[PDB]
Amino acid sequence: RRKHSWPQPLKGAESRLWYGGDYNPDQWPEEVWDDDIRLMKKAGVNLVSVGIFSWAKIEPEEGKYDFDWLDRAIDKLGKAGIAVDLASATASPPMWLTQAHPEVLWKDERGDTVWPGAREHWRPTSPVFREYALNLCRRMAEHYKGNPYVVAWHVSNEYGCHNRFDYSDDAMRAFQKWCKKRYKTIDAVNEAWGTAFWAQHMNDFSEIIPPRYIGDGNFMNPGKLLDYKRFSSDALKELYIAERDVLESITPGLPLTTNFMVSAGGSMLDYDDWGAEVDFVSNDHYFTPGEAHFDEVAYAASLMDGISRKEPWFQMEHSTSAVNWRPINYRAEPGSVVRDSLAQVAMGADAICYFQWRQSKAGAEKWHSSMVPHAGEDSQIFRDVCELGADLGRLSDEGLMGTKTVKSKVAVVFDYESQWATEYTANPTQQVDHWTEPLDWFRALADNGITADVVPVRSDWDSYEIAVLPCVYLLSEETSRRVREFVANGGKLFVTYYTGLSDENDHIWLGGYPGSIRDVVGVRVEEFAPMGNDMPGALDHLDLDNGTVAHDFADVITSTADTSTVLASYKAERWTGMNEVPAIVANGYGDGRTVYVGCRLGRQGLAKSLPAMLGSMGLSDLAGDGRVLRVERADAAAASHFEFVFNRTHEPVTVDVEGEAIAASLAHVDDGRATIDPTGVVVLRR
C-alpha cells in the first residue's frame, strides 16, 4: 500500500483546501485564458487539472511534440497563484495513432471493432498502446520535471469508463496468463469454474477463451464471468502502474493519482484494490436527480473515505448542475453547488473540483454544466461557485485540512466482487444487485439519526461496534471466520438476504443458506421466494407483521436456533406457503448479537424496523433526529472538531447545534439553533 502523499502548496503558499476543476485551454483561443484567470481568482480557485485529453495537441503527429502552448497556460495559472495537476495526456490517443495502428482498438463481445469518434477506444492489454502511452509519459515528465507550478500527476482518465471489457486476442492472451497466475494449474481452473457441467472441461490454458458472444439469452459460465471482471480490473490496474512508475521515475516525489468512478451503483473496477496504488485517492461523482440526490452524494463520499482508510481524499470531478449523459439531464436544485461540495468535504475530502471550469461550446459534452456556464459570469451557478470558493477559503482559515471524518458506530459493508457476482444472469432474480442494499441501510440509518461509515469488505468493518452485511453474496472461508469472530467477541451484526450464498469462486455453501455462517445468525433457509410483477398471479409483495412490506425477494426460513428471537414474520395467504415464515430474526452468539433480515424492505421498511432490531441487540438509545445528517471531522491530537449539518428534507428545519458557525448556505444560526432550509447546510467549529 503506498504511503499517503497529498499535493502540496505552491512555493510561497500555505496549506489550503484545494478548489478548482478540469481546465481545457486547448479548446479556447489564447485570449480567453486571461479571462479564465480573472474569474478563477474571483471564484477562489487554486488548483485546476490540465492536459487530460491533450495527446493530439502535445504529439500532433507521430514523434513530433508541441509543448509551448501548455507551458504558457501553466505559467499564467502559476503566476496567478493557481496550482496545476498535470495529466499524463494518455487518456485517449490521436487519430494518426489509431490510423497507423488499428490493432490498438478494443473489440466487443462479438469481435466488433470499437472505432474512434468518442474516447478511450483502446485495448487495456495492447502492447502497442502501452509503448505509446509510456513514451508520452516519459516525454511529459521529462519536459515538466521541476516545473514550479505542477503539484501532482493525473494519470490517464477514468480507466475502464469505456474500455473495461476487451475481447481481442490481446485480452485472450492476457486472460490466460492471469488465470495461470491465479490458479497455477488448469485443473484448479476447471474446479473453480465447475467445468464438469456442459462439457466445458479444459485440457490446458490455451483452451481458456474470454466470455465472447454466445448468443442472446444463453448463459455464460458464471465463475468464468466473475473472474473476467477481476481480470479486467487487474489488467487496467497493471497499465496504470506502468504509467505511474514511468512518471515517478522521472519526477520522484510528485504525488500521483488516477480518478475513480465511485458511486452507489458504480462497479467498473475493484476500487478498493486500486486505492492501494495511488498516493491519494480521487473520485469522479455525479448526483442522482430526485429523491436520492443528497443521501447518495453523502454515501459515495463516505465510501470514498473508506477506500482512503480515512486519509484525506480528493474530489476530482463532480457537476455544478445537469450532466450531458443521462436520458433526461435534470438540473440540480438551487443550493447544490455549495451543499454537495460541503458534503464531500464533510466525508473527508480536502479538495473540491468540478468537471469542468468553462462549459464547452462545441463537442459531445457542450451540454454538461460547468463552473462558468455558457451564460458566463452573470449566472447563479457562477455566483454559487464564487460563494463555495469563499466558504472553502474560510474552512481553510479554520484549519480543516488533515482532520479526518470520525469513526462511526456502524460500518456498512460494500464489496465490489459481490456486486459482480450478483450481475450474473441466472441468479435467483435479476432484480437483486448487491449495491442497492448498502445504500438503503445507510439511508435508513440516517432516518434514525445515525451517520454510518461505508466500509469496503477487505477493510476494518470488524473493528466497529456495529456492522452490516447487506447482500454480501460472496463470503470466502476467511471472511466467514471474520464474521464468527466479530460476533463471538461482542460484535453486533446485521446480515441480509443474498448474503453468503457462495464462496469467492461462486461455489454454493451447502446445507441451508447462508451456508457458511448460519450457525452465527441462527437461521436456516431452504429456498427463496423471489417476487415481482412480470407474471400475472405471481407474488408481488409480502406484508410483514411489524407494518412493513417486503418486495423483490424473501428468504424461506424454515428453522431458527434456540438462542434466536423472531422479531417479524410474513403475512400471506395460506396457499403461498409464506404465512408466518420468519422475516426478521435476532440471535445471540458468544458475546455478541445478530439480526437477520430475510427480505428487501427498502429504505422505508428498514428505517421503521431499525428501532426494534437495535433493541434486540441492546441498543435502544441510538434514537436520533433523521431530518438532518450530522457529519463530524476531527484531529483528536490537535483537539479540533468540526460538524457539518445537512437538511435531508424538503421543508425548513431548526435543530440544536454546538459551537461557532463558520459556514452557512441556505441556513442561519441564532444562538444556538440552526434554521436550515432545504438543500441547506451549516458548518460548526466546537
Ligand X SMILES: OC[C@H]1O[C@H](O)[C@H](O)[C@@H](O)[C@H]1O
List interacting residues with ligand X (CB under 6 A).
Answer: 16, 44, 46, 81, 157-158, 161, 259, 261, 263, 266, 284, 286, 317, 323, 325, 355, 365, 368, 389-390, 393, 396
Handedness of CA 202, 207, 211, 216 (dihedral sign): negative
The grid coordinates listed for 620 are: 435502544
Amino acid at 686: R
Measured from the CB atom, is 431 or 565 closer to a second copy?
A: 431
Task: Compute the distance between CA of residue 340 and CA of residue 293 in angstroms, rounded to an integer.
Answer: 9
Contact partner at residue 249 from a second copy, ligand X, none, CB < 5 to 8 Å by partner kind: none
CB 674 within 8 A of CB 661: yes
Contact partner at residue 431 from ligand X, a second copy, none, CB < 5 to 8 Å by partner kind: a second copy
Partnered with residue 226 across adjacent β-strands are none
423 is catalytic: no
Measured from the CB atom, is 77 or 666 closer to ligand X?
A: 77
Instruction: Please state the φ and ψ torsions of residue 469, each to the nearest 5 degrees.
Output: -95, 95
Burial of 289 (0-12, 13-18, 19+ CB in 10 A): middle
CB of 197 to a second copy, least distance (A): 4
Contact partner at residue 639 from a second copy, ligand X, none, CB < 5 to 8 Å by partner kind: none
Strand extents, DSSP E, 540-581: 542-544, 549-560, 565-571
Instruction: Name the residue among 225, 210, 221 with its Cα closest to residue 176.
Output: 210
Q: Count the neighbouring beta carbons within 10 Å of the beta carbon of residue 60.
A: 12
Gyration radius of the chain's alpha carbons: 26
Contact partner at residue 650 from ligand X, a second copy, none, CB < 5 to 8 Å by partner kind: a second copy
Burial of 643 (0-12, 13-18, 19+ CB in 10 A): buried
Report the residue closest to ligand X, judged by CB: 44
CB 627 within 8 A of CB 602: no
Contact partner at residue 615 from ligand X, a second copy, none, CB < 5 to 8 Å by partner kind: none
- Give kind and range of the element (H or E) at residue 680: strand 673-685
CB of 65 to a second copy, least distance (A): 14
Rounded to a whole number of angstroms, the distance between the first and last alpha carbons of the chain is 34
Instruction: Name the residue among 610, 527, 612 with its Cα closest to residue 565.
Output: 612
CB of 534 to ligand X, least distance (A): 14
Instruction: Please state the φ and ψ torsions of residue 410, each to the nearest 5 degrees.
Output: -125, 130
Measured from the CB atom, is 14 or 218 closer to a second copy?
A: 218
Measured from the CB atom, is 267 or 459 closer to ligand X?
A: 267
Measured from the CB atom, is 163 or 315 closer to a second copy?
A: 163
CB of 41 to a second copy, least distance (A): 21
CB 470 within 8 A of CB 157: no
Measured from the CB atom, is 167 or 644 closer to a second copy?
A: 167
The residue assigned the cell 414474520 is 569
The residue assigned the cell 490455451 is 206
CB of 50 to a second copy, least distance (A): 13
- Give kind and range of the element (H or E) at residue 166: none
User: What's 11's DSSP letter?
Assistant: T
Instruction: Name the residue among 396, 496, 466, 397 with its Cα closest to residue 614.
Output: 466
Contact partner at residue 57 from a second copy, ligand X, none, CB < 5 to 8 Å by partner kind: a second copy
CB of 429 to a second copy, least distance (A): 5
CB of 574 to a second copy, least distance (A): 7
Measured from the CB atom, is 266 or 678 closer to a second copy?
A: 678
Measured from the CB atom, is 41 or 507 closer to a second copy?
A: 507
Contact partner at residue 428 from ligand X, a second copy, none, CB < 5 to 8 Å by partner kind: a second copy
Contact partner at residue 44 from a second copy, ligand X, none, CB < 5 to 8 Å by partner kind: ligand X
Task: Compute the distance between CA of residue 210 and CA of residue 409 in angstroms, rounded to an integer.
Answer: 43
User: What's 558's DSSP letter?
Assistant: E
The grid coordinates listed for 394 are: 474560510
Measured from the CB atom, is 191 or 273 closer to a second copy?
A: 191
The residue assigned the cell 513530433 is 64
CA–centroid distance for 598 within its chain: 26
Q: Which of 59, 120, 158, 243 is catalytic?
A: 158
CB of 392 to ligand X, least distance (A): 6
Q: How far is CA 227 from CA 178, 179, 188, 192, 264, in A?
A: 9, 8, 13, 10, 22
Contact partner at residue 314 from ligand X, a second copy, none, CB < 5 to 8 Å by partner kind: none
CB of 245 to ligand X, least distance (A): 22
478 is catalytic: no
CB of 216 to a second copy, least distance (A): 8
Contact partner at residue 327 from ligand X, a second copy, none, CB < 5 to 8 Å by partner kind: a second copy
Length of the chain: 686
Measured from the CB atom, is 115 or 325 closer to ligand X?
A: 325
Pairing of strands 628-635, 640-647: antiparallel
The grid coordinates listed for 668 are: 442561519
Q: Which of 243, 277, 296, 317 is catalytic?
A: 317
Catalytically active residues are: 158, 317
